[PDB]
């Protein structure tokens, strides 16, 4: 338990099958970095003591994580990055639950540390291939939805008239008919006295099919399957299957990885798409000195399985916070991601053909952010509009139509070689001339 | 305050909420296809085959989830491997519409790196189709 010569092994060669971790580490004053890195490697069975009391175990001779590198953090005075290698034999094949138990189960309480943040993980190809992963992934999703060469467009339903299931479905219909690909159950809408789940599912299925008959395009609504119990959760997933509807939704951090992986496998087995909402992520991922950075939680989700993932907004963020967001968007979507510290990517990640996950971005209040979103995310993203469609003065359907026109004109202008950073306002104003819905949204 | 019409107002995915792309607008999209190394291809359908439908689901048990008929259209000739000049696509668009005047025609693009369809937008709506609105759709 934290001997520093056993666990801090700076000449260790990293194996290909190892799981690597990068911990941003804040030692208690007077505690040297090599002792802290070793303690995190060891996960000592005393978290209060910070000393080797009971030393010599077969859980700690060959099944030990080793701290193979400690680096200073530039500009900080008491923070270090500790790199820990874990042998692949430590981990249950295909169990995100068990990997977090092994890596983050205990060390965040260790008294020798003042603060500890898990920045990144290297998931080796040998571990990656044990997971079912996302039910479809971005490509399959585009083929199944028949939708190519632009972002997908969503909006959250917050009805003006009631939270009843029938009014919920009316609003879904109005948004979808106007041009949106998807609408979205709010993450807390599971099954309440004001709106029981099965009533919600039925009225949303009528709305989806009505807007689909009307538009001739494939339509969905993310039907929240999050439940108190796995059996209730699967009751809802089964209902969606039987309605023949395209997509369901899960809040993977509050339901849990065990339930999320069960659901992702059900969705692979029955061709449902799985939208993933990230409620409570800021409990864990917000503070710079403590917790687990979202890129790790996104990587976990890609392993556990989800076809879309809420990935934040880039509205109101500086270029440096935007570099970070684009880093984890590449970890979500791409097959091979290279080490890139300035984007916060600490490890080369090889997804080994595991399908990518579509990021879902909060678009802003209005449609003038559309050029920035298209330039930053590119086509493989859902842009969610929280009140673009509904702050529109003419209502949900022209608001949807205004968002769809703006996305399509920005897409057209991007393909024509125009610089959306410079000319995006000129692209929108030019589409306002022929689109009365977009012209009324820009009056706002 | 205007009302988005539900009548005869069918959409055909990417770019269908814009005015119909002129020849210059199609040529500029083909330039985007060619610069990326993508493979253009044309596809067409008659109006009754143009938009998503559920009629095959009569044969099914409970597996209709994300199944829909008429996503596939019919290929016009072959994917234009080695297409570098946009005037070939524009000539092929004219030839398809001449052979099939009652057909919608879409231009698709394939990326042989990622081995997947990567674009698809409409280049021709048939006059005789009443299913769609001439951008006075309100």
């Amino acid at each position: 338990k934290d001997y520093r010569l056993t666990y801090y092994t700076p000449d260790y060669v990293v194996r290909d099958t190892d799981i690597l971790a990068a911990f941003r580490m804040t030692p208690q004053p007077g505690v040297p970095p090599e002792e802290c890195g070793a303690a995190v490697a060891a996960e000592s069975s005393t978290g209060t003591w910070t000393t080797v009391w009971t030393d010599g175990l077969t859980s700690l001779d060959r099944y030990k994580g080793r701290c193979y590198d400690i680096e200073p953090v530039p500009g900080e005075d008491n923070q270090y990055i500790a790199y820990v290698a874990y042998p692949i034999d430590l981990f249950e094949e295909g169990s995100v639950t068990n990997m977090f138990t092994s890596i983050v189960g205990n060390v965040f309480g260790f008294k020798a540390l003042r603060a500890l943040r898990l920045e990144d993980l290297r998931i080796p190809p040998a571990y990656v291939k044990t997971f079912v992963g996302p039910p479809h992934g971005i490509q399959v999703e585009r083929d199944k939805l028949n939708k190519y060469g632009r972002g997908l467009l969503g909006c959250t339903i917050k009805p003006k008239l009631g939270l009843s299931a029938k009014n919920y479905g009316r609003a879904v219909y109005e948004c979808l008919r106007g041009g949106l690909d998807f609408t979205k159950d709010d993450e807390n809408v599971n099954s309440q006295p004001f709106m029981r789940w099965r009533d919600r599912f039925l009225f949303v299925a009528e709305a989806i099919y009505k807007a689909q008959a009307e538009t001739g395009e494939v339509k969905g609504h993310y039907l929240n399957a999050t439940a108190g119990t796995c059996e209730e959760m699967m009751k809802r997933a089964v209902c969606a299957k039987e309605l023949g509807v395209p997509i369901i939704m899960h809040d993977y951090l509050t339901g849990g990885f065990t339930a999320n992986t069960s659901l992702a496998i059900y969705c692979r087995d029955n061709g449902l798409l799985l939208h993933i909402h990230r409620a409570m992520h800021a409990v864990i991922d917000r503070q710079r000195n403590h917790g687990i950075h979202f890129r790790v939680l996104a990587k976990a989700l890609r392993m556990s399985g989800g076809d879309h993932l809420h990935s934040g907004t880039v509205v109101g963020k500086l270029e440096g916070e935007r570099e970070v967001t684009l880093g984890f968007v590449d970890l979500m979507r791409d097959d091979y991601v290279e080490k890139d510290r300035s984007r916060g990517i600490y490890f080369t990640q090889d997804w080994c053909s595991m399908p990518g996950v579509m990021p879902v971005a909060s678009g802003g209040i209005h449609v003038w952010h559309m050029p920035a979103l298209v330039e930053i995310f590119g086509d493989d993203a859902c842009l969610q509009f929280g009140g673009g469609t509904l702050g529109h003065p003419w209502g949900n359907a022209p608001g949807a139509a205004a968002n769809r026109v703006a996305l399509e004109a920005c897409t057209q202008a991007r393909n024509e070689g125009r610089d959306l950073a410079r000319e995006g306002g000129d692209v929108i104003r030019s589409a306002c001339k022929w689109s009365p819905e977009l012209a009324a949204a820009c009056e706002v | 305050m205007m009302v988005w019409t539900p009548v005869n107002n069918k959409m055909f995915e990417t770019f269908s909420y814009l005015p119909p792309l002129s020849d210059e607008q199609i040529a500029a999209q083909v330039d985007y296809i060619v610069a990326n190394g993508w493979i253009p291809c044309l596809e067409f359908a008659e109006s009754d085959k143009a938009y998503v439908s559920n009629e095959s689901a009569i044969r099914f048990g409970s597996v209709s989830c994300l199944y829909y008929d008429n996503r596939y259209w019919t290929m016009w000739k072959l994917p234009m491997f080695g297409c570098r000049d946009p005037m070939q696509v524009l000539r092929e668009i004219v030839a398809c519409t001449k052979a099939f005047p009652d057909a919608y025609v879409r231009l698709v693009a394939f990326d042989n790196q990622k081995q997947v369809q990567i674009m698809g937008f409409l280049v021709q709506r048939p006059k005789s189709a009443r299913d769609w609105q001439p951008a006075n759709k309100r």
Partner: peptide, 22 residues
């Protein structure tokens, strides 16, 4: 994604497409 460099259409391209349509 690469920057789409524009292609000038051949002279009287308009005259070429018009003939074909007929």
């Amino acid at each position: 994604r690469v920057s789409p460099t524009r292609s000038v259409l051949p002279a009287n391209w308009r005259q070429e497409l018009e003939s074909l349509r007929n």
